[PDB]
Design a protein around this ligand. Structure first.
Ligand SMILES: Nc1nc(=O)c2ncn([C@@H]3O[C@H](COP(=O)(O)OP(=O)(O)OP(=O)(O)OP(=O)(O)O)[C@@H](O)[C@H]3O)c2[nH]1
Ligand SMILES: [Mn+2]
Ligand SMILES: [Mn+2]
Length: 269
C-alpha cells in the first residue's frame, strides 16, 4: 500500500503511532513524506534516523525547515532554540544523517499513480518538464560538495515570477521558494512571500496557488504539506493538503492512496 504523511516536524511519537495504526510494513508498503521532517517538535533526531533507515520504502521531498537545518549544520545560519535541533546537531551520526538529507529530492513523480509531490506544491507557472528541470538543478547543487554556498544564496524573496530566461542566483532562489515556501499566488501566478493565513482570511487578489489552473494540476494529482493554516481543507479535487499542524497541537494526517482513506493521529502536545 501507499501512504502519504504531512509535515512531521520532529513529532516522532505521533509518526510511529500513525504508521502502527495502518500497520506500515516496509517491503510491502511505501511511505511518501511531504518534508519538514525536523524542527519545533522534540524528536528531529529520531525522525531523521528512522526515515533514512527506510531506504527505497520512503519517497521524501525537502521542505523549508529541512533546508534551514542544513544551513545551520553548515554554519550558514544561526540555530534558533525554539527549533529544538541541538540533539540532532550534536549527535555522533549528525554528519551521516545530514549528508543523506541533502541528497533527497525536492519533487517526487509516480506516473502509474498519476501523482506528484513537493513540499509547497507546484506553481501554476510550471509545466511538468520545467518542474522536473528545476528540481534537478537545485538537487544538483544541494548534493554537491559546495552546498553551503547555495544554502547561503537561497535566502531571499525575489524574483517571484518564473521565466525560462531566469539565470543564476535569482533562478535558484525562485525555484526554492516555489517548491518550499509557496502559498498564495497573484492572478498571473506570481508568488507572494508574506501571507501565511487561510485562503478565507487572505486579502484580494491573492488566491491559493492550487486555485489557479496549471498544466501539472490539470493532468496529475498533487500532494503537498507546508501550509498548516490551510488545515488540510478547502482544496479542489485532485489536490491533497496533508499538513494538519501536528507540531502545533493539531494532528498528523496519513492518506492511503489506493482508497483515498484518511488516518489521523492527535498531537501529544
Ligand atoms: N492562522 C493560522 N491558523 C492555523 O491553524 C495555524 N497553524 C499554524 N499557524 C501559524 O502559521 C505559521 C506558519 O507555519 P506553518 O504553516 O507550519 O509553515 P512552516 O513551513 O512550518 O513555516 P513558515 O515560516 O510559515 O513557512 P514559509 O516561511 O516557507 O512560508 C506559524 O508561525 C504558525 O504559528 C496558523 N495560523
Ligand atoms: Mn512545516
Ligand atoms: Mn514548510
Amino acid at each position: 500500500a501507499t501512504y502519504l504523511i504531512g509535515d512531521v516536524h520532529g513529532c516522532y511519537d505521533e509518526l510511529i503511532a500513525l504508521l502502527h495504526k495502518v500497520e506500515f510494513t516496509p517491503g510491502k508498503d511505501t511511505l511518501w513524506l511531504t518534508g519538514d521532517l525536523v524542527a519545533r517538535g522534540p524528536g528531529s533526531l529520531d525522525v531523521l534516523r528512522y526515515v533514512k533507515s527506510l531506504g527505497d520504502s520512503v519517497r521524501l521531498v525537502l521542505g523549508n525547515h529541512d533546508l534551514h537545518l542544513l544551513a545551520v549544520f553548515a554554519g550558514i545560519s544561526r540555530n534558533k532554540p525554539k527549533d529544538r535541533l541541538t540533539p540532532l546537531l550534536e549527535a555522533p551520526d549528525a554528519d551521516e544523517l545530514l549528508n543523506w538529507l541533502r541528497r533527497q529530492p525536492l519533487l517526487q513523480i509516480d506516473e502509474e499513480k498519476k501523482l506528484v509531490m513537493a513540499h509547497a506544491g507546484i506553481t501554476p507557472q510550471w509545466d511538468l518538464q520545467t518542474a522536473k528541470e528545476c528540481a534537478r538543478d537545485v538537487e544538483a547543487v544541494l548534493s554537491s560538495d559546495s552546498y553551503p554556498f547555495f544554502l547561503d544564496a537561497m535566502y531571499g524573496d525575489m524574483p517571484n515570477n518564473w521565466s525560462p530566461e531566469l539565470r543564476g542566483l535569482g533562478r535558484l532562489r525562485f525555484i526554492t521558494n516555489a517548491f518550499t515556501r509557496m502559498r498564495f499566488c497573484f492572478p498571473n501566478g506570481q508568488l507572494d512571500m508574506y501571507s501565511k493565513e487561510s485562503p478565507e482570511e487572505a486579502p484580494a487578489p491573492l488566491k491559493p496557488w492550487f486555485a489557479i489552473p496549471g498544466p501539472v494540476a490539470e493532468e496529475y494529482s498533487i500532494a503537498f504539506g507546508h501550509w498548516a493554516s490551510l488545515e488540510g481543507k478547502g482544496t479542489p479535487e485532485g489536490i491533497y493538503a496533508l499538513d494538519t499542524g501536528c507540531c502545533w497541537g493539531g494532528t498528523l494526517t496519513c492518506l492511503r492512496w489506493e482508497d483515498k482513506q484518511y488516518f489521523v493521529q492527535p498531537s501529544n502536545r
